[model samples]
Target: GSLPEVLQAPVGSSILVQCHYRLQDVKAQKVWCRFLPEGCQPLVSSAVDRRAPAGRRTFLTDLGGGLLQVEMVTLQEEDAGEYGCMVDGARGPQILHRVSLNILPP
Candidate 1:
């Protein structure tokens, strides 16, 4: 199913995006993105070149085997959105998981 995994957190708090998948594309790097009308905005990546901040308030980690994680700190309502756990690969993005974040009252 492509139904988004729903998550909730208070506006002032933080949340983790635990993207569990049964995939690995060798050289394909992990990516955490917020889905936008035009595209999925790359928030954080496992790319060596992009090891630094893009998702300054966010952090991404590979949970060994077949799991990925994204921790978003200092949450705001602006962080609420549809997101994807993806792979940056030869054919572009390979969406492995879908998530919807709902911000609650602080």
Candidate 2:
């Protein structure tokens, strides 16, 4: 899977992170997340935003299309980071989307 450009979503709104692959494989891993405070490996799992944390983040598996939707928006400064989708294929782990999130005050 390869990442698309970083997308900006308004507060209280929702945006979708689309990941597409130039090659086809089954061992690919799709993760949607921002860098942690230390900025290490990405944190990934199968969970929705609301069910995870508030004003933070959550990732849901769209098994139908391999899309991750970051919903229930509450934009904070910390929310701004490297938004990415990783694909662990036979080659290696590649970053699909390297998006920088910025929330404007309305």
Candidate 3:
């Protein structure tokens, strides 16, 4: 399992992150979301077909063998926040990793 605890990127730049896990279901649901103190809101899901949320600057890919790649482009101040990478579990979604995105001024 590999995921960054903190990410730094400049404005208008595109960022790529890799989230890896072990002994997990490949066909299972994978998701990225805004990590809030009280709740987490889903932003993207692996179950969603590619080219979705049209014009979205954020999305992710599954590279089998417990690797999930995530990308977000055209970042801005609003993009600076905490997020979580999750995989569906027997009870519900479990967050295997979390990160804080820090936007750097260009």
Candidate 4:
């Protein structure tokens, strides 16, 4: 099951979407994406973002014990949407958790 299935935020705050999974056949590639009516638009991948420093855009963190978190450093009205935390494995990308971000007016 996903944690914090829904969230509300002010226009300038930060958010952290947490995802947890079980031990698997392979080390999964953690991913964060925004869900649009069209499809899931990928924002960051731990496989890549782990090499970079955490910043205002977004970043991935490994909290160990199969826990991963996607941190959105700064919020905005445009950021309101359904965000998904996923993992890439032998079967490809699988959603581990999801969060709906509702933005409050400034």
**Candidate 2 residue pairs that clash:** 2-96, 3-96, 3-97, 49-58
> Which structure among the candidates has the greatest lDDT?
3
- lDDT (0 to 1) per candidate: 0.74, 0.53, 0.75, 0.72
Question: Higher lDDT: candidate 3 or 4?
Answer: 3
Candidate 3, residue 82: the lDDT equals 87
lDDT tens per residue, model 2, 1-106? 2653655766666555555543463335555556667653556643322223323455445343444444435455456556665666678766666666666567
All candidates: TM-score: 0.77, 0.60, 0.79, 0.79
Model 4 residue 92 CA deviation in Å = 3.5
Preferred candidate (lDDT higher): 2 or 4: 4
Q: How does candidate 2 score on lDDT? A: 0.53
- Residue lDDT tens for model 4, 1-106: 4354888889778886677866671276676777888887877666532532333567777655677867786787877778787787777778888888899876
Native-referenced Cα lDDT, model 3: 0.75
Superposition TM-score, candidate 1 onto the true structure? 0.77
**Model 3 lDDT, residue 93, Cα:** 69
Question: Cα RMSD for candidate 3?
Answer: 3.1
TM-score of 4: 0.79
